């Protein structure tokens, strides 16, 4: 570039970060998605609906598995999403080359969290408008993590990203609990993503990825209509 | 209207440089004189308090053997020009086994006068006067922040610059003698100082073809005071 590289994010009179707030708003305007960590492994359930029946959902996926044991979903803007996904995809490898061993979920969130962190403060460029929900199964116990535009991360048994995520968050608070099997997590995830879904739900209106302790798996529209038919 | 610091004026020229010309108007005033007997230069230290130690103020350091110089306005900006110019003369003595002429030091500074920019930093706000003896003898020079150079005979800078140049061109001629120019200069100096004249208030810069170096010293000056 021109070498200007000044961070456009300054501190507000209260110290808040304007552009990060606005990116949080853009995530809030993202697509409704959910994920549940319980018992055998993690279950991630997002929502992908076509603005026109011309669109073909067999083409692009909202779920992009990082490794056979670790998947990932998101909310917010796909353009950024695909980018940082390519980045983390490349990044797990160096860890592999060093140790010859699958990189732990925690460590992924660590390094990607740092990439996003520096990416905020980086020179003359906006932050991301994406909030990730990362799943993974390691050492017998699976894990579910969540990112934010500022790079911070947490852990949940279930959560939601996108519109209504507070409402469906409280729904997951009461209904979902404890630790229950993939069938139950998928059930209540289809209920809570059925909340803000349109009047019709089809195999192509949503996407369900699952983290078994046998390894991550991406379900096809076949099984998606199988369990949800018979929705909830 | 904050524009690039490199922008020309509508009349016009560089803003910050033309302002740096005004930056010297407030600095310490000095008067040099070029006379066939030798170059004599003089400055007022402009001392404030008894805290202020009088020998710690020097507006004149001898650049080379045969080259003196004076400064104005800001000081630590001039330090770099002074030192690096000494380096240039000494490298001239490297190659050519001679004395770098007083006139070639001038352009050896004013050629690097304006390098300042952002990409690819601030201009210097200090005027200089060059005394020295080359093969043609005594030479008094004058330079500005923008790098424009002109050779003078008796030149002033600082706050008194205007009226000291008036009364100076009033009292000057080409038949001057050394001490005549010294005392005639300190006449203007003691008209342009607020405090009474003493040994501390001023310092003299003098160079002559065979009388050297010199530089100059006090207690000669302390005699020149009462010599008025």
């Amino acid at each position: 570039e021109r070498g200007y590289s000044f961070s456009l994010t300054t501190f507000s009179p209260s110290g808040k970060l304007v552009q990060i707030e606005y990116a949080l708003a853009a995530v809030a305007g993202g697509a409704p998605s959910v994920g549940i960590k319980a018992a055998n492994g993690v279950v991630l359930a997002t929502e992908k609906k076509q603005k026109s029946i011309l669109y073909d959902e067999r083409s692009v996926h909202k779920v992009e598995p990082i490794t056979k044991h670790i998947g990932l979903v998101y909310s917010g803007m796909g353009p950024d999403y695909r980018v940082l996904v390519h980045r983390a995809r490349k990044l797990a490898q160096q860890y592999y080359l060093v140790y010859q061993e699958p990189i732990p979920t925690a460590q992924l969130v660590q390094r990607v969290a740092s990439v996003m962190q520096e990416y905020t403060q980086s020179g003359g460029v906006r932050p991301f408008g994406v909030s990730l929900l990362i799943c993974g199964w390691n050492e017998g116990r699976p894990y579910l993590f969540q990112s934010d535009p500022s790079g911070a991360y947490f852990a949940w048994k279930a959560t939601a990203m996108g519109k209504n995520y507070v409402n469906g968050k409280t729904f997951l608070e009461k209904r979902y609990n404890e630790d229950l099997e993939l069938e139950d997590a998928i059930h209540t995830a289809i209920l809570t993503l059925k909340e803000s879904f349109e009047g019709q739900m089809t195999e192509d209106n949503i996407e369900v990825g699952i983290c078994n302790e046998a390894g991550f798996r991406r379900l096809t529209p076949t099984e998606v209509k199988d369990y949800l038919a018979a929705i909830a | 209207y904050d524009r690039g610091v490199n922008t020309f004026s509508p009349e016009g020229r560089l803003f910050q440089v033309e302002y740096a010309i005004e930056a010297i108007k407030l600095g310490s005033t000095a008067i040099g004189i070029q006379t066939s007997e030798g170059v004599c230069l003089a400055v007022e230290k402009r001392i404030t308090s008894p805290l202020m130690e009088p020998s710690s103020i020097e507006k004149i350091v001898e650049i080379d053997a045969h080259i003196g110089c004076a400064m104005s306005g800001l000081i630590a900006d001039a330090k770099t020009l002074i030192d690096k110019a000494r380096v240039e003369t000494q490298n001239h003595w490297f190659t050519y086994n001679e004395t770098m002429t007083v006139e070639s030091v001038t352009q050896a500074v004013s050629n690097l006068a304006l390098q300042f920019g952002e990409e690819d930093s601030r201009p210097f706000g200090v005027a200089l006067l060059f005394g020295g003896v080359d093969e043609k003898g005594p030479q008094l020079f004058h330079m500005d922040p923008s790098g424009t150079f002109v050779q003078c005979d008796a030149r002033a800078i600082g706050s008194a610059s205007e009226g000291a140049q008036s009364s100076l061109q009033e009292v000057y001629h080409k038949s001057m003698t050394l001490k005549e120019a010294i005392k005639s200069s300190l006449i203007i100096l003691k008209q342009v100082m607020e405090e009474k004249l003493n040994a501390t208030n001023i310092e003299l810069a003098t160079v002559q073809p065979g009388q050297n170096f010199h530089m100059f010293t006090k207690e000669e000056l302390e005699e020149v005071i009462k010599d008025i």
């Binding site: 060093v98 140790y99 010859q100 061993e101 732990p104 460590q107 660590q110 | -």
Partner: protein, 204 residues
């Protein structure tokens, strides 16, 4: 030679539920006896050790860089390191210098941190790993170590028979070679606790 300049030998051997590792105490330049206090076998974590043989500068340097990477690793992740991770880590560390390769013989003897499972491995100086279920030997002379170990080692040993076994192997393995000698130290570790002894070696 290059490796035989400072000399030295490192031997590690897997027991039943434990693992033994031993090396000589000697230091010196060629035939000159310098100091017998020198340390080669170094601790990494707990219930896990590592040995080194070759140039003492490469010994100390590798121990330092290694201990560095391990400290960062376990500082970032509360778990203690696994032996395989340490293996591939050292291999990576030795291959990082291909045309500028160090001179050493890394020998890793340590238990699994999760279970008690014993484990041993030895590498090549450029980073080629190797794993065996009986013993890994690295050092000056071959017929000594491979000879006596192939002539002795048994599948299942109590810590005692393991101890005396690697003891006679290191004694009679040293007594034929002059550049190795001057005292031997033996580390024998188990899941419960670590035991170390000092053999009585001929100072000849």
């Amino acid at each position: 030679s290059i490796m035989s300049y400072n000399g030295g030998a490192v031997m590690a051997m897997k027991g039943k539920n434990c693992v033994a590792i031993a090396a000589d105490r000697r230091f010196g330049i060629q035939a000159q006896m310098v100091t017998t206090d020198f340390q080669k076998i170094f601790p990494m974590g707990d219930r896990l050790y590592i040995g080194l043989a070759g140039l003492a500068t490469d010994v100390q340097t590798v121990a330092q860089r290694l201990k560095f990477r391990l400290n960062l690793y376990e500082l970032k992740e509360g778990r203690q390191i696994k032996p395989y991770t340490l293996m591939s880590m050292v291999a990576n560390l030795l291959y990082e210098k291909r045309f500028g390769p160090y001179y050493t013989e890394p020998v890793i003897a340590g238990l699994d941190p999760k279970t008690f499972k014993p484990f041993i491995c030895s590498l090549d100086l450029i980073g080629c790993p190797m794993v065996t279920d009986d013993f890994v030997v690295s050092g000056t002379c071959a017929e000594q170590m491979y000879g006596m170990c192939e002539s002795l080692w048994e599948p299942n040993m109590d810590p005692d028979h393991l101890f005396e076994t690697i003891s006679q192997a290191m004694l009679n393995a040293v007594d034929r070679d002059a550049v190795s000698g001057m005292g031997v130290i033996v580390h024998i570790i188990e899941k419960d606790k670590i035991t170390t002894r000092t053999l009585k070696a001929r100072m000849d």
